[PDB]
Design a protein around this ligand. Sequence first.
Ligand SMILES: CC(C)(C)c1nc2c3ccc(F)cc3c3c(=O)[nH]ccc3c2[nH]1
Length: 286
Amino acid sequence: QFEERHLKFLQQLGKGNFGSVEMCRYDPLQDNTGEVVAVKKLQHSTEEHLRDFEREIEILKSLQHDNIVKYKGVCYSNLKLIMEYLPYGSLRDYLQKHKERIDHIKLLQYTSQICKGMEYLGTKRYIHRDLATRNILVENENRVKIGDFGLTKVLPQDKEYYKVKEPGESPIFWYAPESLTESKFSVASDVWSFGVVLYELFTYIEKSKSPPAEFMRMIGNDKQGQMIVFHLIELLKNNGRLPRPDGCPDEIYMIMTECWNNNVNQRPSFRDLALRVDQIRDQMAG
Ligand SMILES: CC(C)(C)c1nc2c3ccc(F)cc3c3c(=O)[nH]ccc3c2[nH]1
């Protein structure tokens, strides 16, 4: 395992849901030769959150894929999850800061990698429940990885959905309608959220174009608080949706809109999404 005393704090990397990630140097020889790693811990340790965190660690450990962040180990005294350090950070921040470097061809490369990571999740009957560019990490210019699994659940053997309603705040603007109305989560709801991820990427994370900002304008910024979810549900029911991003090819927007089907069963599979994206990639290449 990883020893507490040899883990040297460098900087705060990010915060998500109930967890917090830090950049640390694991230096067991105490000579400044150890590798830099990412360390996740609970911001406030609750027995409920500890049980969730334990399951999260088991989830990640069970995953080995090019497009999933690498598990390295755990640290015991206050449980800590040790992951590989991915030096380019979240895709959200990377894309926003370096939009001149990243073209549509690169966006589709990332899109394909996300789909392949998600198909791998589905093969283990894992539902991510929090697909968003903030949860995707960049290893290098050519490779992204699904980088957090704080909300990830395993499907029961006998059902194709999973019902969960967690205390606090949910990413409602990435949620499928049945996740908002029924608290139902499935591969199909992950596909819906993947549509939002695709939207995010093609907006190049322009602040005014974010899903929350766009939906809030459609709902009306003169919104309440508890009624926001109620109005969001109604908007989606009446086929109100995120607009086509500036400069987004019509065929890419079609993929988004097909992911955003109210009919759960009519949403494409991650396998078919990868196929469609890779086909568009090749047609943009030659
Ligand atoms: C906020 C969230 C929990 C999604 C998170 N942010 C990061 C992150 C941010 C910047 C950075 F340079 C690296 C990371 C990082 C990382 O390197 N490994 C695992 C997770 C993770 C991370 N996980």
